[PDB]
Design a protein around this ligand. Structure first.
Ligand SMILES: O=C(O)[C@H]1O[C@@H](O)[C@H](O)[C@@H](O)[C@H]1O
Lengths: 390, 388
């Protein structure tokens, strides 16, 4: 039951030499130098590699799942906001698992409204100290959602607790949604089928299915966001569902946007051993075999192109590998160029509290711990404004 | 990391496990007819071994050039013919090739059954045959017993596995693997052949010759291998149904031994000490035998209804002798679809007590991890029942 935190390299001068797999080079050798070759041949190859070998295939539905608007409050924050609560039935079982989506929209705004779709560690009461909710404690996670700031910009926020989809604990997938999608002769996901992170991501796509039917939400302006293991999830939700307009990776780190081949802080083995439920079976083959990965996480960031992404790091989060987060963005730059979009705007990793967001890939590494703080939201909304407003 | 110190050899300490049901299809259908087995269940299981354990080998639209580069009808002082077939493994003739050595017994009525062996060493080690030259001539004789095979009216074909792919982790830069990549590929895909898949494919190229031979009974070629080449011999038998009988010499871990027993050698011990043996995908089952979508009783089931002999050795605790027997035991429900019996006992037999009156033979013999004369006595008694 090893503690991988002690065994990990954090010494930049002891990172092994490595070659990144070429994002632009198709499996048959053909290089991409056109968005059309990208969209038609290469992006599908990479999308297939990540689905087969890392996240795993989630169920594809023939119809949108049943959902209800079970409560509406049009005067939710002394009239500043409409709060809706939407129950999304994930299975054929009405007594089975549901998303309890909580949507805040600002009042006194005329258009359709851009929305942050976030996924939370804790129930919806923890997002805002909202005096029309009951019971951590009410608004205990406000720092990490900054709903006042989101409302100030004329955007909304929709969140649900990831536990709603799949409990985050290694119960060999007898709980959550997995078992409801097994075949009659299957007690476990196949090696190429979804683990937990893919289930949570699929979760966000079922939330987006509701959102595009909400008259007040701008379906063309939905940002996905999540922190840490839910960072990983948000980036996959963005990669695997192109309806999301903008993707926010909050210290996603290892198997997020960090480059695995650096073997800095958290590694694939640390990851799969501690969290066997997170990724598909296929992915456990890469435990301390990073060099044999058919891809690296720069290719995951490449699946967001041309759409914008904000990669945020924390100065104290060496576990997440802040330089490797930066280099995962750097590595996607060649694909954004096919679309005539610039890069991050700097060659080497910038110093602390130095945001770059003038390109389609934004980056900062902020002072303090592994978290989403007001600082982070400050930059996220500045970046969102560039796309969601004129 | 040493794996010798982590090995359980204590039968009382073997963990709880469920064998994955060999007769339950992925979609739920229970197999109770050999038709459902052949049309549905077997294809599913073969695909799982191919994709997740051994790795997909190239399928060829037509055979490769073979050439009989020397015969001698009077070999071993008249007793046998010796043939030397070269076998191209590629379009390129300067590419890798198999040096196939075949001995056929002189003056026998009818086409001859052949044991297709794959050997650790070059062919001159199989017998002290003066017509050869030079791990010296005759070294492996003890493990091949040509005299006894000839005496039975059977011959013996052998090539050294080094001909097809070297036994060491070179990232598949040597051997056959490079000659089948596609532009933009330095390395097999995770679902593609490693060295056991290549060595097994090797024995398929050897059979591709053996059938064309006019003195060979191509409906009566056995496959035999010891140890890592015993794991190869089973996969050969499973992924090429032309072979008539399969001989597992101490195949052990990722041969016929039940992976879920974690007795002696484990999957992690194997993939970590021999990264090149199995496909990339198989490395995902390190310390995760609970989560294999199969176990080795299903690999044995791919032989059915063709017979198979599982030989264990008493000192070879590493191979898990009881789990080898239980790989056989667990196949019996598929052989039963073909109105065939099982091994013939419930508990693992005592030492030097062969059971070979069903389509699955088992013996645990005295002494070390090896192929010994005793083993061949029993392999030939078994072959006699299907080959006379
Ligand atoms: O004897 C040998 O060299 C090999 O035998 C095999 O059956 C076993 O899987 C290997 O670990 C090694 O023991």
């Amino acid at each position: 039951r090893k503690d991988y935190a002690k065994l990990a390299n954090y010494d930049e001068s002891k990172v092994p030499q490595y070659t990144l797999p070429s994002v632009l080079m198709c499996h048959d050798g053909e290089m991409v130098q056109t968005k059309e070759q990208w969209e038609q041949k290469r992006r599908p190859e990479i999308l297939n590699l990540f689905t087969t070998y890392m996240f795993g295939k989630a169920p594809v539905l023939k119809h949108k799942l049943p959902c209800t608007v079970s409560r509406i409050n049009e005067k939710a924050l002394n009239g500043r906001a409409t709060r809706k609560e939407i129950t999304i039935q994930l299975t054929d079982d009405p007594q089975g698992p549901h998303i309890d989506l909580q949507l805040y929209l600002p009042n006194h705004v005329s258009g359709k409204i851009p929305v942050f779709l976030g996924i939370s560690f804790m129930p919806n009461y923890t997002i805002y100290d909202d005096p029309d909710l009951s019971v951590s404690f009410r608004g205990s996670m406000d720092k990490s959602w900054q709903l006042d700031k989101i409302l100030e910009h004329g955007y909304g926020l929709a969140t649900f607790c990831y536990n709603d989809v799949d409990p985050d604990f290694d119960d060999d997938f007898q709980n959550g949604v997995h078992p409801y999608y097994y075949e009659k002769g299957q007690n476990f996901p196949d090696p190429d089928q979804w683990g937990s992170i893919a289930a949570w991501a699929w979760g966000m796509s079922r939330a987006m299915d509701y959102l595009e039917t909400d008259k007040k939400v701008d379906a063309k302006k939905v940002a996905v966001i999540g922190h840490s293991r839910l960072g990983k999830t948000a980036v996959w939700a963005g990669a695997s569902d192109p309806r999301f307009a903008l993707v926010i990776s909050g210290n996603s780190g290892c198997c997020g946007v960090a480059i695995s081949r650096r073997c800095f802080g958290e590694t694939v083995e640390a990851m799969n051993v501690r969290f066997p439920h997170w990724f598909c079976g296929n992915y456990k083959q890469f435990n301390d075999r990073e060099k044999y990965l058919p891809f690296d996480q720069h290719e995951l960031v490449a699946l967001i192109a041309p759409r914008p992404i904000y990669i945020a790091s924390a100065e104290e989060d060496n576990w997440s590998d802040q330089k490797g987060e930066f280099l995962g963005g750097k590595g996607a730059e060649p694909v954004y160029a096919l679309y005539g979009l610039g890069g991050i705007g700097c060659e080497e990793m910038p110093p602390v509290d130095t945001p770059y967001m003038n390109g389609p890939i934004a980056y900062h590494n902020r002072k303090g711990p592994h978290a989403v703080l007001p600082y982070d939201w400050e930059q996220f909304l500045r970046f969102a404004d560039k796309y969601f407003k004129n």
